[PDB]
């Protein structure tokens, strides 16, 4: 008989840090002889550089696929009256120095030496798309899904009022427009309460943004492990080539250099393999996030537990550091009530199966109600179709029907 509108937040990683690893500087810097031996050792450096270049290209393509999905950039109107809705939390604020929303301003503040790694041949390439471009894409997506609904996802954008779009979504999930057009203020208040509650939950609990923090911590731990593995001795007399060059002559240091490379290149290959596995996992997560964006942001999906738990209505995308944040607005009914039901009734020798819903009774009279909402309506011939007789239907009950042509006579 009632409902509770709640907002569910889903965090999905999109991309990671693009790292380019030097060969000569990481293995043995300022050493011409070590570079000579290294080249003889083979062409591992070209393969590793190609692998990291392909990883960076894959991450770049993933970012462009997940975020850059609309051909045109839309702009919100200056004055906002979306049927009395508090959309200022998700809309960009011109008062802030950045174009990110205050929800996004809380989002980037919950996600966290580089010179030592930069010196030893480990460089982090900056992402191709800046945060401003991602924020502009998010604002364009929000403007498209608010001021035009889901029509902009398929083709050109068609303007439509927000209550009219909400009624379209209710008709998509099977709820009539009577519930929206009779309880619009209650729905707006419930949405505002859910937005405030999820904002307070995001502010109070920092453990919600865990996957992006886990990815960042894993990358930092891998870099620190690589540095400490550079610090390893690898069974030689010393862990630095300068000491071996100063102590040993080159012919006697040939074996020590060979023992260093056999193991330093192995650590490089292990790091490349771990980065490839992490990139494959990030690619799967980014494909899932792009599918979720295209099937919840650009339209309404009837699939259960894909666009959030419950009857999904719409999702608001949010920009996140190295990821995306979805605000799934779902329809959760409440305030249940027991009733007495029958599968079919027959008035005079012929069954009258309902077109939509089932027949329910409060104890004395039978009425026609919908599947999700309790709207008592009189039984007529408009919502019931006749087929056969009530001789093979199990659980039949005798009742009368109302004919609109009867008062005419």
């Amino acid at each position: 008989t009632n409902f509770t509108i709640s907002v569910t937040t889903e965090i999905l990683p999109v991309s990671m840090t693009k790292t380019s690893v030097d060969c000569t500087m990481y293995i043995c810097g300022d050493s011409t002889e070590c570079s000579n031996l290294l080249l003889q050792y083979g062409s591992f450096c070209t393969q590793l550089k190609r692998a990291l270049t392909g990883i960076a290209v894959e991450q770049d393509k993933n970012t462009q696929e997940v975020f850059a999905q609309v051909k045109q950039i839309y702009k919100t109107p200056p004055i906002k009256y979306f049927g009395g809705f508090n959309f200022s939390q998700i809309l960009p604020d011109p008062s802030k120095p950045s174009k990110r929303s205050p929800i996004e301003d809380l989002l980037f503040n919950k996600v966290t030496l580089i010179c030592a790694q930069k010196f030893k041949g480990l460089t982090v390439l900056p992402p191709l798309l800046t945060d401003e471009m991602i924020a502009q894409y998010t604002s364009a997506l929000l403007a498209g899904t608010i001021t035009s609904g889901w029509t902009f996802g398929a083709g050109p954008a068609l303007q439509i009022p927000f209550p009219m779009q909400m009624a379209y979504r209710f008709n998509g999930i099977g709820v009539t427009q009577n519930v929206l057009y009779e309880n619009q203020k209650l729905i707006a208040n419930q949405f505002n309460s859910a937005i405030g509650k999820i904002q307070d939950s995001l502010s109070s609990t920092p453990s919600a943004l865990g996957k992006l923090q886990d990815v960042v911590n894993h990358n930092a731990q891998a870099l620190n492990t690589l540095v400490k593995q550079l610090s390893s001795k690898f069974g030689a007399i010393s862990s630095v080539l300068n000491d071996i060059f100063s102590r040993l002559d080159k012919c006697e240091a040939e074996v020590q250099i060979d023992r260093l490379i056999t193991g330093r290149l192995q650590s490089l290959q292990t790091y490349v393999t771990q980065q490839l596995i992490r990139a494959a996992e990030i690619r799967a997560s980014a494909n899932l996030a792009a599918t979720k964006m295209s099937e919840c942001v650009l339209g309404q999906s009837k699939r259960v537990d894909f666009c959030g738990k419950g009857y999904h209505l719409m999702s608001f995308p949010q920009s996140a550091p190295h990821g995306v944040v979805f605000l799934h607005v779902t329809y959760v009914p409440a305030q249940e009530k027991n009733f007495t039901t029958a599968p079919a009734i027959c008035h005079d020798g012929k069954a009258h199966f309902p077109r939509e819903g089932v027949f329910v009774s409060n104890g004395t009279h039978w009425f026609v109600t919908q599947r999700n909402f309790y709207e008592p309506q009189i039984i007529t011939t408009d919502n019931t179709f006749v087929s056969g007789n009530c001789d093979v239907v199990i659980g039949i009950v005798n009742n009368t029907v109302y004919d609109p042509l009867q008062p005419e006579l």
Binding site: V70, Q72, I73, L125, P126, T130, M133, A140, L158
Partner: protein
Amino acid sequence: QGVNCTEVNVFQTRAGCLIGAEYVNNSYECDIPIGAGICASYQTSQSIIAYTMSLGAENSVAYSNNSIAIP
């Protein structure tokens, strides 16, 4: 990459600094990526130019509470 031109048609970006390519204020659909919202392209005489990315075609939707558009 990561090296400023001070230590080394000169333009600098977040990734570093580049030479041989001029800067164009107008933003088109770029082809060759550079880094941090910058691109490079070969346009008109003919020379390599650098410019920021176009986010997309501008299209402002007039929102009203009593009007609709149907194809």
